Each structure stands twice: as structure tokens, then as C-alpha cells.
Write a protein that binds this ligand. Sequence first.
Ligand SMILES: CC1CCN(CCSc2cc(-c3nn(C[C@@H](O)CN4CCC(N5C[C@@H](O)CC5=O)CC4)c4c3CN(S(C)(=O)=O)CC4)ccc2C(F)(F)F)CC1
Length: 221
Amino acid sequence: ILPDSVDWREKGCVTEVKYQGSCGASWAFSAVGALEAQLKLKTGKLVSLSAQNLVDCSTEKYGNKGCNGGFMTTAFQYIIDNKGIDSDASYPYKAMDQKCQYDSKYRAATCSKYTELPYGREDVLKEAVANKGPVSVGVDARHPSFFLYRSGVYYEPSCTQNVNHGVLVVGYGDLNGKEYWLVKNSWGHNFGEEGYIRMARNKGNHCGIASFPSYPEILQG
Ligand SMILES: CC1CCN(CCSc2cc(-c3nn(C[C@@H](O)CN4CCC(N5C[C@@H](O)CC5=O)CC4)c4c3CN(S(C)(=O)=O)CC4)ccc2C(F)(F)F)CC1
């Protein structure tokens, strides 16, 4: 039996909501967000990791195209191969494609492995969120209702299970008769509920939230 609700923000495992701007780097924000939580769990320190590092460096070898899109999974593989990722403070976000400027002197996290969860399995996603930490996911955000969301549990009748926007599932719950996923977006603090959107849970993989989940890990040693 899993907890009825979880919110990794209450464990100090989630950094401030970021603002991707006109650069399509939600995949990089989803990836660093998941890794930030594992880093806090392991070292006790909460530090924003560099999304810009992924945009500029996890490029064609990883099937990614910076501001024109990418994958959380191959962002993790880049961090594995690179043997690190810089802090966001040392390599801050510029919302544009740049030359890779990774500097091991400012390494703030490492990545040992990542795991992918089965398509559409909201039970498995719930278990991972409860027992592993925030989970990187894609959602179908191509709906004016998504851009216009202010509060409550988001439900979009025309949503599909094809994903196009990377976000971070930092929890779940059940409020006002509606089960939801607690989702950290990267459109700044003025989007939704202080930068978060609660999305309908157990409604047949609504907006593809469980289509392509993955989470990274940092192992001892
Ligand atoms: C320029 C492109 C523009 C679009 N972006 C993503 C679109 S957004 C997006 C898409 C996905 C995503 N992952 N996968 C699984 C697989 O395809 C991933 N790949 C497996 C093999 C891997 N590897 C390992 C290497 O060794 C070789 C290789 O190929 C590489 C990864 C799919 C999708 C989209 N779906 S769909 C239309 O929903 O059905 C098709 C299948 C996930 C998150 C996002 C998120 F929104 F969160 F960002 C990608 C770059």
C-alpha cells in the first residue's frame, strides 16, 4: 500500500521553478529536476543543476537538438558519459543554443544510471514517485487550455497520449474528489499554481503523462 499523497517539495528535494522562455528546452529542465532530487537525497544539498549544460553539450550524439527539443533519457546518458554536470549557478540558463562550455571544476552532480518505466502504467509511475523520487515525464501540452491553466486539476478532453513537452512529476494526491499528478513545469512562477500544474491521474494516461517516464540515480561510490 502506497501513500495517499506525496510531495517531494516537502522533503526539500525540488529547486525553484525555472523559466524556459522561447527555447524549447523543457526536456533539459525535466532531466535536471529529476537529478536535483537524487542529489539532495544523497548529499543533503539542494542545488539547481545546469539545464544550459544539457542544451549546449547533450546534442547530436544523444539525438538532441538543444532549443529545438530533446529526450530526458539521453540527457541522463550524456551526464553518465560526461562524468558530471555543472551547477546551474556556474553555467546559468540563457534560453538559446550555445557552444558547449562544460567545466569539470564546477561539477555539481554525477549520474550512475537511469530507468525507463512502461508505457501508460500509472500504477508503476505512482510507485516510482513514492519509492524513488520525482520522475521525468513528457505530456501533451499542445492545447490552449494548458497555456491558460491557472489552478485546480487539469483535464483536457482532447488530450492525446503523444507527448511533446518535458515536465517533472514531483508528487501526486487526491483533492476535492479529483486524483492528480503534481507536476513541476518550466514556464516560470506565473504559470498555474506558482509554476506547478496538477494533472488528472488514473484517467487513462491523460495527456500521455505516463507514456515515457524515466528517472536517474546517483549510487554510493
Ligand atoms: C529533434 C527531436 C525533437 C523531439 N524530441 C522529443 C519530442 S518530446 C518527448 C518525446 C519523448 C519520446 N520518447 N519516445 C521513446 C523513444 O523514441 C526515445 N528514444 C529511444 C531510443 C534512444 N536512443 C539511444 C541511442 O543510443 C540511440 C537512440 O535512438 C533515444 C530516445 C518517444 C517519444 C515521443 N513519442 S510519441 C510521438 O509521443 O509517440 C514517440 C516515442 C519523450 C519525452 C519527450 C519530452 F517532451 F519530454 F521531451 C526529440 C528530439
